[PDB]
Design a protein around this motif. Structure first.
Motif, PDB file in Angstrom:
ATOM      1  N   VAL A 156       0.850  -1.175   0.000  1.00 56.20           N
ATOM      2  CA  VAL A 156       0.000   0.000   0.000  1.00 56.20           C
ATOM      3  C   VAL A 156       0.889   1.230   0.000  1.00 56.20           C
ATOM      4  CG1 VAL A 156      -2.048  -1.029   0.991  1.00 56.20           C
ATOM      5  CG2 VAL A 156      -0.235  -0.175   2.534  1.00 56.20           C
ATOM      6  N   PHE A 157       0.567   2.245  -0.817  1.00 54.05           N
ATOM      7  CA  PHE A 157       1.364   3.452  -0.957  1.00 54.05           C
ATOM      8  C   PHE A 157       1.465   4.321   0.312  1.00 54.05           C
ATOM      9  CE2 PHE A 157       2.474   7.597  -3.138  1.00 54.05           C
ATOM     10  CZ  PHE A 157       3.778   7.218  -3.480  1.00 54.05           C
ATOM     11  N   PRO A 158       0.440   4.537   1.152  1.00 59.15           N
ATOM     12  CA  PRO A 158       0.595   5.242   2.430  1.00 59.15           C
ATOM     13  C   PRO A 158       1.405   4.498   3.488  1.00 59.15           C
ATOM     14  CG  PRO A 158      -1.678   5.463   1.631  1.00 59.15           C
ATOM     15  CD  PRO A 158      -0.976   4.413   0.779  1.00 59.15           C
ATOM     16  N   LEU A 159       1.818   3.242   3.233  1.00 54.35           N
ATOM     17  CA  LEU A 159       2.599   2.404   4.131  1.00 54.35           C
ATOM     18  C   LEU A 159       1.810   1.867   5.322  1.00 54.35           C
ATOM     19  CD1 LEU A 159       6.037   4.330   3.971  1.00 54.35           C
ATOM     20  CD2 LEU A 159       5.348   2.376   2.536  1.00 54.35           C
ATOM     21  N   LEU A 160       1.613   2.676   6.379  1.00 56.03           N
ATOM     22  CA  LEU A 160       0.911   2.221   7.571  1.00 56.03           C
ATOM     23  C   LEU A 160       0.220   3.343   8.338  1.00 56.03           C
ATOM     24  CD1 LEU A 160       0.530  -0.499   9.185  1.00 56.03           C
ATOM     25  CD2 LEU A 160       2.429   0.280  10.653  1.00 56.03           C
ATOM     26  N   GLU A 161       0.693   4.594   8.195  1.00 54.49           N
ATOM     27  CA  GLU A 161       0.276   5.689   9.044  1.00 54.49           C
ATOM     28  C   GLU A 161      -1.050   6.322   8.644  1.00 54.49           C
ATOM     29  OE1 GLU A 161       2.315   6.335  11.857  1.00 54.49           O
ATOM     30  OE2 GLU A 161       3.156   4.471  10.968  1.00 54.49           O
ATOM     31  N   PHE A 162      -2.027   6.321   9.566  1.00 54.60           N
ATOM     32  CA  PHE A 162      -3.274   7.035   9.399  1.00 54.60           C
ATOM     33  C   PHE A 162      -3.575   7.853  10.643  1.00 54.60           C
ATOM     34  CE2 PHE A 162      -6.169   4.484  12.009  1.00 54.60           C
ATOM     35  CZ  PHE A 162      -5.570   3.216  12.014  1.00 54.60           C
ATOM     36  N   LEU A 163      -4.064   9.105  10.459  1.00 58.37           N
ATOM     37  CA  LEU A 163      -4.702  10.000  11.429  1.00 58.37           C
ATOM     38  C   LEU A 163      -4.913   9.444  12.847  1.00 58.37           C
ATOM     39  CD1 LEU A 163      -7.728  12.348  10.448  1.00 58.37           C
ATOM     40  CD2 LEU A 163      -6.906  11.959  12.786  1.00 58.37           C
ATOM     41  N   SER A 164      -4.068   9.841  13.815  1.00 55.60           N
ATOM     42  CA  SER A 164      -3.987   9.159  15.103  1.00 55.60           C
ATOM     43  C   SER A 164      -4.858   9.784  16.189  1.00 55.60           C
ATOM     44  CB  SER A 164      -2.520   8.934  15.570  1.00 55.60           C
ATOM     45  OG  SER A 164      -1.908  10.102  16.120  1.00 55.60           O
ATOM     46  N   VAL A 165      -4.963   9.119  17.366  1.00 56.90           N
ATOM     47  CA  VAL A 165      -5.685   9.590  18.556  1.00 56.90           C
ATOM     48  C   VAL A 165      -7.156   9.953  18.319  1.00 56.90           C
ATOM     49  CG1 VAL A 165      -5.478  10.753  20.795  1.00 56.90           C
ATOM     50  CG2 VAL A 165      -3.426  10.315  19.425  1.00 56.90           C
ATOM     51  N   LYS A 166      -7.928   9.013  17.748  1.00 55.04           N
ATOM     52  CA  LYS A 166      -9.312   9.252  17.385  1.00 55.04           C
ATOM     53  C   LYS A 166     -10.280   8.787  18.464  1.00 55.04           C
ATOM     54  CE  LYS A 166     -10.082   9.452  12.931  1.00 55.04           C
ATOM     55  NZ  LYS A 166     -10.614   8.886  11.691  1.00 55.04           N
ATOM     56  N   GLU A 167     -11.388   9.526  18.650  1.00 52.86           N
ATOM     57  CA  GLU A 167     -12.285   9.390  19.782  1.00 52.86           C
ATOM     58  C   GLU A 167     -13.473   8.468  19.508  1.00 52.86           C
ATOM     59  OE1 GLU A 167     -12.850  13.757  20.273  1.00 52.86           O
ATOM     60  OE2 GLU A 167     -12.199  13.405  22.371  1.00 52.86           O
ATOM     61  N   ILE A 168     -14.588   9.031  18.998  1.00 58.10           N
ATOM     62  CA  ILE A 168     -15.872   8.360  18.847  1.00 58.10           C
ATOM     63  C   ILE A 168     -15.863   7.100  17.986  1.00 58.10           C
ATOM     64  CG2 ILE A 168     -17.146  10.450  19.338  1.00 58.10           C
ATOM     65  CD1 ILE A 168     -17.912  10.461  16.242  1.00 58.10           C
ATOM     66  N   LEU A 180      -5.680   0.876   2.179  1.00 58.16           N
ATOM     67  CA  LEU A 180      -5.981  -0.055   1.101  1.00 58.16           C
ATOM     68  C   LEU A 180      -6.559   0.588  -0.159  1.00 58.16           C
ATOM     69  CD1 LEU A 180      -7.500  -2.899   3.344  1.00 58.16           C
ATOM     70  CD2 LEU A 180      -5.378  -3.092   2.000  1.00 58.16           C
ATOM     71  N   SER A 181      -7.012   1.850  -0.073  1.00 58.91           N
ATOM     72  CA  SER A 181      -7.529   2.620  -1.199  1.00 58.91           C
ATOM     73  C   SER A 181      -6.484   3.605  -1.708  1.00 58.91           C
ATOM     74  CB  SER A 181      -8.798   3.404  -0.758  1.00 58.91           C
ATOM     75  OG  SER A 181      -9.599   3.863  -1.850  1.00 58.91           O
ATOM     76  N   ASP A 182      -5.267   3.553  -1.130  1.00 56.66           N
ATOM     77  CA  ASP A 182      -4.133   4.412  -1.423  1.00 56.66           C
ATOM     78  C   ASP A 182      -4.381   5.921  -1.201  1.00 56.66           C
ATOM     79  OD1 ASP A 182      -1.863   2.542  -2.008  1.00 56.66           O
ATOM     80  OD2 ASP A 182      -3.161   1.887  -3.686  1.00 56.66           O
ATOM     81  N   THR A 183      -5.126   6.277  -0.126  1.00 58.76           N
ATOM     82  CA  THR A 183      -5.428   7.633   0.381  1.00 58.76           C
ATOM     83  C   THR A 183      -6.766   8.224  -0.062  1.00 58.76           C
ATOM     84  OG1 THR A 183      -3.065   8.291   0.245  1.00 58.76           O
ATOM     85  CG2 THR A 183      -4.534   9.775   1.353  1.00 58.76           C
ATOM     86  N   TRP A 219      -7.634   1.156 -12.204  1.00 56.60           N
ATOM     87  CA  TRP A 219      -7.714   1.568 -10.811  1.00 56.60           C
ATOM     88  C   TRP A 219      -7.570   3.082 -10.643  1.00 56.60           C
ATOM     89  CZ3 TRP A 219      -9.795   1.344  -6.492  1.00 56.60           C
ATOM     90  CH2 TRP A 219      -9.236   1.866  -5.315  1.00 56.60           C
ATOM     91  N   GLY A 220      -6.631   3.723 -11.367  1.00 53.67           N
ATOM     92  CA  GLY A 220      -6.416   5.163 -11.282  1.00 53.67           C
ATOM     93  C   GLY A 220      -7.538   6.016 -11.817  1.00 53.67           C
ATOM     94  N   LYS A 221      -8.142   5.643 -12.966  1.00 58.73           N
ATOM     95  CA  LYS A 221      -9.329   6.289 -13.522  1.00 58.73           C
ATOM     96  C   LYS A 221     -10.562   6.096 -12.642  1.00 58.73           C
ATOM     97  CE  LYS A 221     -12.004   6.403 -18.036  1.00 58.73           C
ATOM     98  NZ  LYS A 221     -13.338   6.228 -17.430  1.00 58.73           N
ATOM     99  N   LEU A 222     -10.757   4.874 -12.107  1.00 61.53           N
ATOM    100  CA  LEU A 222     -11.810   4.583 -11.152  1.00 61.53           C
ATOM    101  C   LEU A 222     -11.671   5.369  -9.854  1.00 61.53           C
ATOM    102  CD1 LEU A 222     -14.291   2.865 -10.445  1.00 61.53           C
ATOM    103  CD2 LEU A 222     -12.738   0.942  -9.986  1.00 61.53           C
ATOM    104  N   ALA A 223     -10.459   5.413  -9.266  1.00 59.65           N
ATOM    105  CA  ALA A 223     -10.168   6.208  -8.094  1.00 59.65           C
ATOM    106  C   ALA A 223     -10.314   7.709  -8.317  1.00 59.65           C
ATOM    107  CB  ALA A 223      -8.743   5.882  -7.605  1.00 59.65           C
ATOM    108  N   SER A 224      -9.774   8.273  -9.423  1.00 55.33           N
ATOM    109  CA  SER A 224      -9.879   9.707  -9.684  1.00 55.33           C
ATOM    110  C   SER A 224     -11.305  10.170  -9.864  1.00 55.33           C
ATOM    111  CB  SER A 224      -9.011  10.220 -10.878  1.00 55.33           C
ATOM    112  OG  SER A 224      -9.422   9.742 -12.160  1.00 55.33           O
ATOM    113  N   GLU A 225     -12.105   9.447 -10.662  1.00 51.34           N
ATOM    114  CA  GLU A 225     -13.438   9.900 -10.977  1.00 51.34           C
ATOM    115  C   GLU A 225     -14.477   9.529  -9.931  1.00 51.34           C
ATOM    116  OE1 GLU A 225     -13.143  12.386 -13.150  1.00 51.34           O
ATOM    117  OE2 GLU A 225     -11.067  11.622 -13.018  1.00 51.34           O
ATOM    118  N   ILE A 226     -14.190   8.572  -9.019  1.00 57.97           N
ATOM    119  CA  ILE A 226     -14.913   8.484  -7.749  1.00 57.97           C
ATOM    120  C   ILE A 226     -14.671   9.715  -6.878  1.00 57.97           C
ATOM    121  CG2 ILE A 226     -15.115   7.265  -5.514  1.00 57.97           C
ATOM    122  CD1 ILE A 226     -14.794   4.628  -7.177  1.00 57.97           C
ATOM    123  N   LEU A 227     -13.415  10.188  -6.736  1.00 60.85           N
ATOM    124  CA  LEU A 227     -13.110  11.404  -5.990  1.00 60.85           C
ATOM    125  C   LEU A 227     -13.683  12.682  -6.606  1.00 60.85           C
ATOM    126  CD1 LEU A 227      -9.397  10.634  -4.913  1.00 60.85           C
ATOM    127  CD2 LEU A 227     -11.455  10.396  -3.499  1.00 60.85           C
TER     128      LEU A 227
END
Lengths: 419, 91
Positions: free
Chosen positions: A16-28, A42-45, A167-175
Motif C-alpha cells: 500500500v502506498f501510504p505504508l501504515l500511518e493514518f490519522l492518530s488519537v481518534k475518539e468516537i 488499502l484505497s491508497d489515500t 484503478w487510477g481512472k476509477l479512483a480519480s473519478e470516484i473522488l
C-alpha cells in the motif's frame, strides 16, 4: 481454499502506498475509526472521506496527509493548508513541475490532433506511448486521461499498466464525483480480472480489495454489484483469512442489499455460509454492533434484542459513511426481526411492541396491518383486547404425502397397460 | 353382524318385556319384583353406555370416529400400495 494457502505464507504484508500511518488519537466509535484507517491505506489515500471524517468529530490531522499529495488539485491543497495556517515554506516544487507539465501537455496535444487526423497505426501508438508517461505522472488532467483511456489503454507492457490505469481512472473519478466514468471502470475492472496476470499472492488480494472499494459506497444500482461480487470468487464475508481481516463492514451493506431487493428465504444461507464461516467469526469479535444484529437474530430473543437493535439504530443513524439506503436498512431491520419473531409465535400485544420501540400503539397496529397487507404475517387481530394472535398449527400432514405417492405410481401402472 | 343381530333381538325382547312389566302395574297391580331391581339393571346399562352425556364427550367421540376412519383409510392405502408392488412384480 486454494487462494487462502497463497495468503497463508504472506501474513498481511500488503503493498500500500501510504505504508501504515493514518490519522492518530481518534475518539468516537473506535471500530468505525479503525475501519477508516485500514480502508484509507488499502484505497491508497481517501481524500474526500477526510472531510467526512472531520464532520462527524473534529480532527485537525487530515492536514497531516492532505499536505503531502498535489495531484488532487494543487490549488485545493494549498488553500486547505493556508486556511489552517500551516507555515510550511515548502511549496516550490509545483510552479516548476506544473510548468514542465503545461509544456508537456501542449507538446503532446499538437500530436494528439495529428495522430487522430492521420489515423496512422504506428503514429497513434507512438503518440499514445508518449502520452502514457505524462498521464501516469499527472492525472489532473483527468479528462485528458479519460480521453486517452476511452480508446486504446494498452501499451507494450500490457497487464500492469492497463490494470493500474483502470484503478487510477476509477479512483480519480470516484473522488471527482463523475459517476458514469466510475460505473464504466467498476464494469471494466470486473471484466479485466478473468485472464488474469501472473497472480503472485498479494496481486489477487489487492484486486479483491479494489472490487470492495468501488462496490461499497453506493451511488446507483449497487445491489447488482452486490450480486456480482458475492458469487464472484465464491461467497465469502471478507474474502481473506490469516486472522487480521476487518473490511469489516461489507456484510452489513450486503445483508440489507439482499433484504430490500430479494425475498429473505435466502437469509438462511447468509446465516450459514457468510455469517458462521470463520472469516466472519474473526470479524464478529471486532465489531459488537454487527455482533448484536447476528447474535440476537440467531438466538431469537423477544425483548433484550428489540431494545438493543433500537440502541444500535441510534449509533447507525450517526454513521457518516456512504451507503445511500439508510432508513431502508433500519426499517427493514425492524421488520425482519419482527418477521423472524412472528414465525413461531402465539401472541403479541400491540402496546407491548409500541412501548418497546418508542412508537404510539395505533402506529404499531397500522405497522402490523402493513405486515399482513404484504403477506409477511398470517394473523387474527383482537379488536377489544388489542392483541394480534397467530395460529399456523397445521393439523393433518397426511394428504400432501398421499397426493405424491399415489399420483406417480398409479399413472406409472396405467403407462404399463399398453404393450 | 351376527352378534349385533343377537343384541337387537335381545333389545326388542327388553322393549316387549318392559311394556308388559309397566302394563301389569296399570291393569290392576304388578311390577313388585321388577321395581328397584329393573331400575338398577337399566341404570347399569345407561351408566356404561352411553357413558355420561355432554357436548365435550360427543365431540371427543366424533374426533375418535374420524381417527378410526383415518386409520381405516390408511389401511386401504397400505393395501393399495402392497397392490401397486404386487402389480409391478406379476407381469
Amino acid at each position: 481454499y486454494d487462494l487462502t494457502t497463497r495468503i497463508a505464507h504472506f501474513l498481511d504484508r500488503h503493498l500500500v502506498f501510504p505504508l501504515l500511518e493514518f490519522l492518530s488519537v481518534k475518539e468516537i466509535y473506535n471500530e468505525k475509526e479503525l475501519l477508516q484507517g485500514k480502508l484509507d491505506l488499502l484505497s491508497d489515500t481517501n481524500m474526500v472521506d477526510f472531510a467526512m471524517d472531520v464532520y462527524k468529530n473534529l480532527y485537525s490531522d487530515d492536514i497531516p496527509h492532505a499536505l503531502r499529495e498535489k495531484r488532487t488539485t494543487v490549488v485545493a491543497q494549498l488553500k486547505q493548508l493556508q486556511a489552517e495556517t500551516e507555515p510550511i515554506v515548502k511549496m516550490f516544487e509545483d510552479p516548476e513541475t506544473t510548468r514542465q507539465m503545461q509544456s508537456t501537455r501542449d507538446g503532446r496535444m499538437l500530436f494528439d490532433y495529428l495522430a487522430d487526423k492521420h489515423g496512422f497505426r504506428q503514429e497513434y501508438l507512438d503518440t499514445l506511448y508518449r502520452y502514457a508517461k505524462f498521464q501516469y505522472e499527472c492525472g489532473n488532467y483527468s479528462g485528458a486521461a479519460e480521453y486517452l483511456y476511452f480508446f486504446r489503454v494498452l501499451v507494450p507492457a500490457t497487464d500492469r499498466n492497463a490494470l493500474s490505469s483502470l484503478w487510477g481512472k476509477l479512483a480519480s473519478e470516484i473522488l471527482m464525483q463523475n459517476w458514469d466514468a466510475a460505473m464504466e471502470d467498476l464494469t471494466r475492472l470486473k471484466e479485466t480480472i478473468d485472464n488474469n496476470s501472473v497472480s503472485s499472492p498479494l496481486q489477487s488480494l489487492q484486486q479483491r480489495t479494489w472490487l470492495i472499494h468501488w462496490s461499497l459506497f453506493v451511488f446507483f444500482n449497487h445491489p447488482k454489484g452486490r450480486d456480482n461480487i458475492i458469487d464472484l470468487f465464491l461467497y465469502q464475508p471478507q474474502y481473506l483469512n490469516a486472522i487480521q481481516t476487518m473490511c469489516p463492514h461489507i456484510l452489513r451493506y450486503l445483508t440489507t442489499a439482499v433484504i430490500t431487493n430479494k425475498d429473505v428465504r435466502k437469509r438462511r444461507q447468509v446465516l450459514k455460509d457468510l455469517v458462521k464461516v470463520i472469516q466472519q467469526e474473526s470479524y464478529t469479535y471486532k465489531d459488537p454492533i454487527t455482533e448484536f444484529v447476528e447474535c440476537l437474530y440467531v438466538n431469537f430473543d423477544f425483548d433484550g434484542a428489540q431494545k438493543k437493535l433500537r440502541e444500535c439504530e441510534s449509533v447507525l443513524v450517526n454513521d457518516f459513511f456512504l451507503v445511500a439506503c439508510l432508513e431502508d436498512f433500519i426499517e427493514n431491520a425492524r421488520l425482519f426481526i419482527f418477521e423472524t419473531f412472528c414465525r413461531i409465535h402465539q401472541c403479541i400485544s400491540i402496546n407491548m411492541l409500541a412501548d418497546k420501540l418508542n412508537m404510539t400503539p395505533e402506529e404499531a397496529e397500522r405497522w402490523i396491518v402493513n405486515l399482513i397487507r404484504n403477506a409477511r404475517l398470517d394473523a387474527k387481530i383482537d379488536s377489544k383486547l388489542g392483541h394480534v394472535v397467530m395460529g399456523n398449527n397445521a393439523v393433518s400432514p397426511y394428504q400432501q404425502v398421499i397426493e405424491k405417492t399415489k399420483s406417480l405410481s398409479f399413472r406409472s401402472q396405467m403407462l404399463a397397460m399398453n404393450i | 353382524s351376527d352378534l349385533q343381530q343377537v343384541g337387537g333381538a335381545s333389545a326388542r325382547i327388553q322393549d316387549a318385556l318392559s311394556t308388559v312389566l309397566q302394563y301389569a302395574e296399570d291393569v290392576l297391580s304388578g311390577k313388585v319384583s321388577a321395581d328397584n331391581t329393573v331400575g338398577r339393571f337399566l341404570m347399569s346399562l345407561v351408566n356404561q353406555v352411553p357413558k355420561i352425556v355432554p357436548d365435550d364427550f360427543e365431540t371427543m367421540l366424533n374426533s375418535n370416529i374420524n381417527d378410526l376412519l383415518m386409520v381405516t383409510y390408511l389401511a386401504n392405502l397400505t393395501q393399495s400400495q402392497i397392490a401397486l408392488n404386487e402389480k409391478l412384480v406379476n407381469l
